[PDB]
Amino acid sequence: MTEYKLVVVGAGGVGKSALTIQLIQNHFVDEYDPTIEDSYRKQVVIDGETCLLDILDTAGREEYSAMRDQYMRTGEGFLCVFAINNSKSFADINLYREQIKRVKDSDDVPMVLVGNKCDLPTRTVDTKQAHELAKSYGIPFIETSAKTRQGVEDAFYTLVREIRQYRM
């Protein structure tokens, strides 16, 4: 069957592991355990297609982020994740996109901007900024919440659709 190699990048603590496990195991991880790397293979049906998702959960902290270039080099689509209560993580979004564009050596790379932790009552990132930023990249933007599962399927499935457009 068809496979989609997905990579989740973003600053440390934004929710990359909680989003993946929410999609893969249908539950919210409350504890924080920093990631070096974690890989998953999960079968799912998107828009009628039975396909296999190959999710690579990368590191956000820099000291953990050794070998981040190689993980990005093999991925086909990227979830660029930031937390809406962490303005530093949203500023880093442009750094992750440029690092992806250079390791893949391509201008168009299937990519989706993700704003996590929308369940939180107070935020520090303007949704108007994220829509504007993703618009200038040519990629979609999706507000998610790994605690309430809001938008979690939307994020990964939209990325898969962006990979289809690339292959087709």
Next chain:
Amino acid sequence: SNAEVIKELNKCREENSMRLDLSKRSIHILPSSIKELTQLTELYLYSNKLQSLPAEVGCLVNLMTLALSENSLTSLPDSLDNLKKLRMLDLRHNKLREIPSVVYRLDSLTTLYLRFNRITTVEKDIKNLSKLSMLSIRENKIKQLPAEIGELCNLITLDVAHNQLEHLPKEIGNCTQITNLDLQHNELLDLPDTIGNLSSLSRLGLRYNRLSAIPRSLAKCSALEELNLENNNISTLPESLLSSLVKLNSLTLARNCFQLYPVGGPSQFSTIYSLNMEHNRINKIPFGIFSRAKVLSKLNMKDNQLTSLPLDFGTWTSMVELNLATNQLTKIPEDVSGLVSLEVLILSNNLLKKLPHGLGNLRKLRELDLEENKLESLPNEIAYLKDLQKLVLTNNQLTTLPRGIGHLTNLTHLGLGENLLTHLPEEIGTLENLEELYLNDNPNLHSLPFELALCSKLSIMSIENCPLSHLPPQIVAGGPSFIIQFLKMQG
């Protein structure tokens, strides 16, 4: 298979690529022909079946990244000294009983992952790897760290979680650049006082140890965002500790010997959004202890010695989730009506005979658990909990439900098991979103209301050990769907 292994080695040197990726190829023995690939700067061999590395790998002098995670290596070739430019060494998920002697000689290493191994010794030669910024020996069998740990003055993260450390060498206070120190799931009996030197320390894992106290010098780690001391032998906190951690988001003193609240007054909870104190011996919550905790939204007092609540407990207006399970509470005060921002209220395993009429003022309440109490009656005011979705009343003395129970238009879970209950109200039919109705172990329930069929989404239901003698024995012998269709007929 092996066909791609030897042929892609020639493919690498023909392309003259500075990167070889032989991962997930089930490789058992790396062929010696890799000595020709001296232009390599990255060699990825993770997720294979290697048990040893060939000596010829020591020819790759230009190597900077060596990924050997998820293998079965027990040592490394002593010829790896020639890799004088190696930066990161990933050896996690292997079978090492000690750090290979050659790794203590790779003084250019900045990143070293030894996670998930059987390592028992950290030699004093670890001081040679002083350019390290990340040292992860998580999930090993290490019982002691040498004092030479203090010469890794570039460390940002020291991950020694899931080991058997009984003491931390006091020289740890010399790794000033540390922001992440993970010591959880060990056997620490105390902590060195020099821990206050790590002024950049923002994340400190101490849970699941044997600590009996916290050094007062921890007040110098004012960058800490979370203090989680779960599962220890601590009873008090040093003077002006919690007030000093001006960036603390959550405090977790669960599973300890706290018989009283920590001293400091209300000024020590002015920054936490959460507070977990479950599984202790606290006999009273101090009056006014939360008069300055204006962001505290979650409180957990489960499994303690609380027999009553403070008089100003009704002023906890910023509380969203409150857990008072497993205590000796005999009464809920009427002042509970002031907690208008409460969304989850857990009161299971207490001595509650009845509930106050002010309970109906919890407009935001979404989940109410009262399992294993002594409830003789429900207050009529439960009808005004418009936002309630889960009500757990299992194991009580309830004989009747208030007829207003049908006003719970958002109720989806109703647990009425292990009660007396002579009957359900006819107003049960207005519970539109009801989905789970547990009625098991009700020896007095000889009938079911005919209006129950109006609950369209009612899928899960248990009726084991219920007489239901007014209903036919053949209908009740079937199951939930049998009585589901039976009630639709007569109506």
